[PDB]
Design an enzyme around this catalytic site. Structure first.
Site, PDB file in Angstrom:
ATOM      1  N   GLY B  10       1.038  -0.957   0.000  1.00  0.00           N
ATOM      2  CA  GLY B  10      -0.057   0.050  -0.078  1.00  0.00           C
ATOM      3  C   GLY B  10       0.890   1.443  -0.157  1.00  0.00           C
ATOM      4  N   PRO B  11       0.058   2.631  -0.242  1.00  0.00           N
ATOM      5  CA  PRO B  11       0.875   3.699  -0.199  1.00  0.00           C
ATOM      6  C   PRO B  11       1.464   4.131   0.860  1.00  0.00           C
ATOM      7  CG  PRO B  11      -1.376   3.989  -0.688  1.00  0.00           C
ATOM      8  CD  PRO B  11      -1.121   2.534  -0.601  1.00  0.00           C
ATOM      9  N   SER B  12       2.224   5.150   0.978  1.00  0.00           N
ATOM     10  CA  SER B  12       3.041   5.582   2.161  1.00  0.00           C
ATOM     11  C   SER B  12       1.948   6.035   3.066  1.00  0.00           C
ATOM     12  CB  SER B  12       3.927   6.806   1.970  1.00  0.00           C
ATOM     13  OG  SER B  12       4.800   6.944   2.851  1.00  0.00           O
ATOM     14  N   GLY B  13       2.149   5.767   4.472  1.00  0.00           N
ATOM     15  CA  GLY B  13       1.313   6.157   5.554  1.00  0.00           C
ATOM     16  C   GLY B  13       0.113   5.380   5.535  1.00  0.00           C
ATOM     17  N   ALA B  14      -0.177   4.550   4.915  1.00  0.00           N
ATOM     18  CA  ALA B  14      -1.247   3.583   5.132  1.00  0.00           C
ATOM     19  C   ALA B  14      -1.200   2.783   6.330  1.00  0.00           C
ATOM     20  CB  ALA B  14      -1.354   2.661   3.656  1.00  0.00           C
ATOM     21  N   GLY B  15      -0.144   2.726   6.996  1.00  0.00           N
ATOM     22  CA  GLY B  15       0.088   2.205   8.254  1.00  0.00           C
ATOM     23  C   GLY B  15       0.698   0.422   8.112  1.00  0.00           C
ATOM     24  N   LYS B  16       1.530   0.339   7.098  1.00  0.00           N
ATOM     25  CA  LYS B  16       2.087  -0.864   6.829  1.00  0.00           C
ATOM     26  C   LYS B  16       3.174  -1.331   7.810  1.00  0.00           C
ATOM     27  CE  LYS B  16       3.877   0.031   2.845  1.00  0.00           C
ATOM     28  NZ  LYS B  16       3.471   1.542   2.759  1.00  0.00           N
ATOM     29  N   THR B  17       4.148  -0.195   8.186  1.00  0.00           N
ATOM     30  CA  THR B  17       5.162  -0.675   9.112  1.00  0.00           C
ATOM     31  C   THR B  17       4.210  -0.978  10.564  1.00  0.00           C
ATOM     32  OG1 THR B  17       6.703   0.650   8.147  1.00  0.00           O
ATOM     33  CG2 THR B  17       7.084   0.236  10.566  1.00  0.00           C
ATOM     34  N   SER B  84       4.836  -2.038  -3.008  1.00  0.00           N
ATOM     35  CA  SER B  84       4.697  -2.751  -4.221  1.00  0.00           C
ATOM     36  C   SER B  84       3.356  -2.272  -4.897  1.00  0.00           C
ATOM     37  CB  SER B  84       4.499  -4.198  -3.567  1.00  0.00           C
ATOM     38  OG  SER B  84       3.528  -4.312  -2.481  1.00  0.00           O
TER      39      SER B  84
HETATM   40  N1  LIG Z   1      -5.061   1.681  12.789  1.00  0.00           N
HETATM   41  C1  LIG Z   1      -4.438   2.580  12.973  1.00  0.00           C
HETATM   42  N2  LIG Z   1      -4.907   3.861  13.663  1.00  0.00           N
HETATM   43  C2  LIG Z   1      -4.366   4.811  14.145  1.00  0.00           C
HETATM   44  N3  LIG Z   1      -3.135   5.095  13.736  1.00  0.00           N
HETATM   45  C3  LIG Z   1      -2.245   4.157  12.742  1.00  0.00           C
HETATM   46  C4  LIG Z   1      -3.281   2.777  12.438  1.00  0.00           C
HETATM   47  N4  LIG Z   1      -2.251   2.141  11.553  1.00  0.00           N
HETATM   48  C5  LIG Z   1      -1.011   3.076  11.698  1.00  0.00           C
HETATM   49  N5  LIG Z   1      -1.118   4.267  12.310  1.00  0.00           N
HETATM   50  C6  LIG Z   1      -0.169   5.242  12.225  1.00  0.00           C
HETATM   51  O1  LIG Z   1       0.211   5.791  11.093  1.00  0.00           O
HETATM   52  C7  LIG Z   1       1.456   6.060  11.111  1.00  0.00           C
HETATM   53  C8  LIG Z   1       2.105   5.607   9.659  1.00  0.00           C
HETATM   54  O2  LIG Z   1       2.245   4.196   9.845  1.00  0.00           O
HETATM   55  P1  LIG Z   1       3.211   3.415   8.990  1.00  0.00           P
HETATM   56  O3  LIG Z   1       2.927   2.074   9.570  1.00  0.00           O
HETATM   57  O4  LIG Z   1       4.741   4.045   9.157  1.00  0.00           O
HETATM   58  O5  LIG Z   1       2.939   3.279   7.586  1.00  0.00           O
HETATM   59  P2  LIG Z   1       3.742   2.978   6.135  1.00  0.00           P
HETATM   60  O6  LIG Z   1       4.628   1.783   6.873  1.00  0.00           O
HETATM   61  O7  LIG Z   1       2.350   2.488   5.407  1.00  0.00           O
HETATM   62  O8  LIG Z   1       4.211   3.832   5.530  1.00  0.00           O
HETATM   63  C9  LIG Z   1       2.197   5.630  12.286  1.00  0.00           C
HETATM   64  O9  LIG Z   1       2.726   6.726  13.160  1.00  0.00           O
HETATM   65  C10 LIG Z   1       1.085   4.690  12.966  1.00  0.00           C
HETATM   66  O10 LIG Z   1       1.491   4.652  14.471  1.00  0.00           O
END
Ligand SMILES: Nc1ncnc2c1ncn2[C@@H]1O[C@H](COP(=O)(O)OP(=O)(O)O)[C@@H](O)[C@H]1O
Ligand SMILES: Nc1ncnc2c1ncn2[C@@H]1O[C@H](COP(=O)(O)OP(=O)(O)O)[C@@H](O)[C@H]1O
Ligand code: NA
Lengths: 173, 173
Positions: B10-17, B84
């Site tokens: 998924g795109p950046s900021g979607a919560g993957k990490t 991806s």
């Molecule tokens: N379900 C959720 N509810 C609230 N915050 C979330 C959720 N999932 C992820 N986050 C927050 O979103 C921010 C970015 O998440 P991250 O996992 O780094 O994104 P990615 O890896 O897709 O770029 C992080 O600070 C994380 O704590």
């Protein structure tokens, strides 16, 4: 839970793949989970069009190091067979891998050629073995590897025994 | 014993990490060996000077997939966090990995922009970076992923429970 990497380095035709395969079979027969990273097979799968410039070979070595790092830190004995001709590259592998067992199959060029004239010819013709000033120019011998075996003087069984003895002495098994 | 790969796309900021880390903690607490594989982290470690032509991005996709394939075939759960963006390259990953769990954190742009600690969206809008997937790079949404989580509507613990529920249904544990 950290396992180890058997990093087999040496010039083409020294006997690396033969020893790698025999070590794999031996450790598997003793009950261990083992993974073999054949450098040329990794190249064929991941980047079959990559060339053999110094920078391209370095990138390939870095990929193999990272695969071996990830496998071994999850408890998988990892056996690597790669020419890895520069000391600096093997010192990088050593710093990346916690339990690093450098194995050098040492063999005079005359014996390496006698054992596989057609295979060495083909690799040299393809640019896979460099030799601007001759075949013996490039490889930098390890200064203090964990194991040196002279493959013109030992059987594969004796080479396996030498590696296993060192693994025992290190406490890795 | 063949293990499985959780492929979080998924795109950046979607919560993957965040989801990757929470799944790692959960599965480790259940007694599994788990490895976290961050796709952009691997690119920055192995070849930070590698470009972004289609051929180079294809290479990198193959490297990440093979790392996951080798780990999962040795019984290690691999959690891959990787933008991806292309459906066809995730189909390659799906074919290479026996037990493949594609996970799509679906999240509107507004919310991704509010979850952007590295400031990627701001950088992309001011031209400091280019081709950010989810802004000026297109993201190709999965047609039939194993799991879709709306991360603007679910908590992380709810996302973990959703992934775990599907892992139970798939029989991959
Ligand atoms: N379900 C959720 N509810 C609230 N915050 C979330 C959720 N999932 C992820 N986050 C927050 O979103 C921010 C970015 O998440 P991250 O996992 O780094 O994104 P990615 O890896 O897709 O770029 C992080 O600070 C994380 O704590
Ligand atoms: N200890 C040994 N005694 C006799 N022949 C050997 C020995 N080790 C390897 N060989 C032979 O040497 C050749 C080159 O070995 P190989 O393992 O393919 O080298 P590398 O992988 O280093 O290029 C093969 O024909 C192999 O059977
Ligand atoms: Na599959």
């Amino acid at each position: 839970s950290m396992s180890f990497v058997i990093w087999i380095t040496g010039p083409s035709g020294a006997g690396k793949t033969t020893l790698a395969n025999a070590l794999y079979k031996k450790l598997e027969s003793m009950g261990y989970r083992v993974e073999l990273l054949d450098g040329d097979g990794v190249r064929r799968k991941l980047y079959p069009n990559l060339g053999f410039s110094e920078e391209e070979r370095w990138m390939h070595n870095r990929v193999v190091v990272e695969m071996a790092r990830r496998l071994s830190r999850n408890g998988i004995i990892t056996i690597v067979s790669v020419v890895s001709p520069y000391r600096a590259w093997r010192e990088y592998a050593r710093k990346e891998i916690e339990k690093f067992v450098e194995v050098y199959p040492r063999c005079p060029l005359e014996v390496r050629m006698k054992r596989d004239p057609k295979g060495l010819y083909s690799k040299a013709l393809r640019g896979e073995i460099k030799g601007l000033t001759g075949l013996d120019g490039e490889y930098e011998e390890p200064e203090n590897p964990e194991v040196v075996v002279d493959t013109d003087k030992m059987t594969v069984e004796e080479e396996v025994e030498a590696v296993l003895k060192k693994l025992m002495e290190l406490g890795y098994l």
